[model samples]
Target: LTLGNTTSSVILTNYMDTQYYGEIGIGTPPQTFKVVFDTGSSNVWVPSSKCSRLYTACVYHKLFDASDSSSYKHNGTELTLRYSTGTVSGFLSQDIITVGGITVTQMFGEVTEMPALPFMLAEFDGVVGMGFIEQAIGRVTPIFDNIISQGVLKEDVFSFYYNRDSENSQSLGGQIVLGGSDPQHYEGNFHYINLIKTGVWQIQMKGVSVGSSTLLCEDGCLALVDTGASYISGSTSSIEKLMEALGAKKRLFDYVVKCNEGPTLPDISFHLGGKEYTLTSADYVFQESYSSKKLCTLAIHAMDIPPPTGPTWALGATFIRKFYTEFDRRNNRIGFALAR
Candidate 1:
């Protein structure tokens, strides 16, 4: 499929590096909604007016009323999605979705049910998935795919630039470039790697090391570059070893350490594509306040997921913010570069 000859950019709003979202318009006359651009999944969903008020979570965000749209068609196909944090059930419908001044008639879900926790705490009303069609549930085509098929983009590519905030600044900056990459956001040349799988942007991971001593994934492994996840997570055993090396204590499923230890933390390096990508102490330790006391926590966590679907590790925002990433759908490859 061929794309258009122009590129478009969308500004992404950061929520403390936990997740990045952007504003988009849905349906005719365009009702605006905040949606997370998730590369790990492949479906877009927003709460529907049909959601019960008893759900509580459903009423906090702007709901999509199909009756208000002049061009709305119900497909009657129900979908149930399970995430690491919550689940949402909804039916399929077609509407005009607009982003970065580009509009397309796309099929998305009208959420009728969702867990209260996700809705209650989420800053965005819904999620817009950017994964491949294979990862999409119900065999639906992803919005980007539709954009390419419709020749709306200059190239079948997308890129992310996450700007880390200073110690005192709450202001965040970032952008998602559709169909092209921004050279100014990165330094030096990009190192490209072929995608090992099409499902969730799976890539080969050579190994991981800390302070020239501890080593993990010696036999190599696969990792999912998930933009939706907040922190880095690996298998139970690997995360335990990593936490131990970082001198962190597990407290109620979270790793915590002395706040002053942040500057003394060792640099952790990830070996990928025969290149060593290092994360400094500041990048691995996140500072938070609890009970009027400042504390530090390792950004890496533990998760138990079997093979194939569950990668050895999920490289979340913790890792992604340290570098610029480009997803090239046309060539089935991913590119990484040091962020400027």
Candidate 2:
């Protein structure tokens, strides 16, 4: 399906290269909120005014007061959402959600109960899921799906450009283009790949290698382009092999190596659609100064997902920062191009 010639662009705010969030307005008066545009899940949620102050984290973010909105419609339905780290319980409500210049009346979760870890660390208040409707936990249509259904978007597509400014931690240079691609951010034609599954933007991964040595998924595998995640996550066996190759030692949950050995580390490459995308040591090894020692940690880690969800590598900011990605809803495909 070809879209109209209209598009919307939103500047994404980066939080220490861990996550990228953007601004969106909710309610009749359009109360502004910072949300993480997550492609890995399908549900929008924000802290509610009824959230317990005992959590402390809830107090830091702006909460949505349904009573304050003139157009708020409560469904009286409760939702419990589970994540890798924690879970949140909330009620469902309908309100005007504004993204860029487009507005849509959509159902969203008003979180009343949440853990402190996410609220304490994340700069964003809530999550705006950009995944498909089928992937939605509550069976509600996603905001992006509503945008396409309402014909507000010129195209049934969205794209992401994450700028990795290693020199400055606070440097912000990320964007989310709704409806179309940005030629200025990317250098060539996009390599399109079919979606293997409807949920979580699952795609076929060709293989992964290190200097002609095949490490994981030699034949084929599944991958998820998750913007919600901070680091690259692979299976336990795959991560072990990768860490061994890099001569990294397990320090707590993360694998660390001598800072001096970072430059000599082998170039890791991910093969997809007949294209081999390589990542230098600087791209995969995250450096940190602990006291007088400069420790370098491997950005990729072990995450053993079960069958169905198992064997699927979560290619997060590590891969997205290198390639400008386009999520094509109309064609049910994903496009990638070298970032300019």
Candidate 3:
């Protein structure tokens, strides 16, 4: 079968449900909240406490309470997550988190009381990340591994299609296929990669290219294929050089670029698991700015991390929005294909 963008769907989940703890409500829980199941980070939290001073955001679902649950307990220490964009700070607690109908009991996580920025506060009450190797609470395996350990799911892979729209959301038809690709679903050769040892699903990015010229820093490059990030970000210098090489007109904003006429940019492919997938320049550049004669019209940013320990590139929504991705927890593999 031919793979098309629209052929895939994602299971939307709302309320970062921690085991034993109550739930943190965010926006109105979809008749079924269809969240893009992410394997990039850990800690399942929600916006129950900060969902508007009036608690309107909490109205979407029920607030989870660690104090109320017998199985829940605070670690007596505050935890903070510092990201490239900002940070989220809260009390650390352990709970059971579930996915794909399987549960990882005694999972440890944070209950956010203070978010670093408005965007972090608004994006979602909280996120369910799979970065951790163990549970958020007690002696338990990671949620993804737990799903695998149990017979409920056949593999370690989890997948997603974040096309949350009115038509699909209303159908109660969105899915989170466990184990492997649904034979009836996406039809594409899966591009594979080895997961980075640190960060949320970071990968060794050899380099990015335009036409045939390669754009990479001397220290080398690594990219975090973060599904959580909303945009593509990387070192200011690398991005500038790349955009220019790709024919994106440059602007003072540094990272932003656009072009109406120029050489057709080639696909930016990543080498992983001995395979590659070409991501077109059109997929990476902002079309509006490019066509409007805008220069450097993209949301490019710079990194401040030291070598080896830091990632030079971030393939976020710019890459993901263009494809249908699946996180197969059972098989420890991820599946990808074109998004309709």
Q: Candidate 1 vs candidate 3: which has greater TM-score?
A: 1
Provide the RMSD of all predictions against the true structure, rounded to 1 decimal.
2.1, 2.0, 7.5
Question: Which runs of model 3 end up more than 4 angstroms from their true locations?
Answer: 1-10, 13-36, 48-77, 94-112, 134-141, 164-175, 183-185, 196-200, 217-220, 246-254, 258-266, 273-276, 289-309, 326-336
Instruction: Sort all candidates by lDDT, best to worst.
Output: 2, 1, 3
TM-score of each: 0.95, 0.94, 0.67
Q: Judge candidate 1 against the unseen true structure and give its global Cα lDDT, from 0 to 1.
A: 0.83
lDDT digits (tens) for residues 265-300 of candidate 2: 898888777888898888887766332267777778
lDDT of 3 at 59: 53
Distance from true position, residue 244, model 1, in Å?
0.7
* Shift of residue 193 alpha carbon in model 3, Å: 2.5
Q: After superposition, how far is residue 129 of candidate 3 from its true place, in Å?
A: 1.1
Question: Candidate 3, overall lDDT?
Answer: 0.48
What tens-digit string does per-residue lDDT give for candidate 3 at 285-321?
5454436454434534455444554545766555655
The lDDT, on a scale of 0 to 1, for candidate 2 is 0.84
Better of 1 and 2 by lDDT: 2
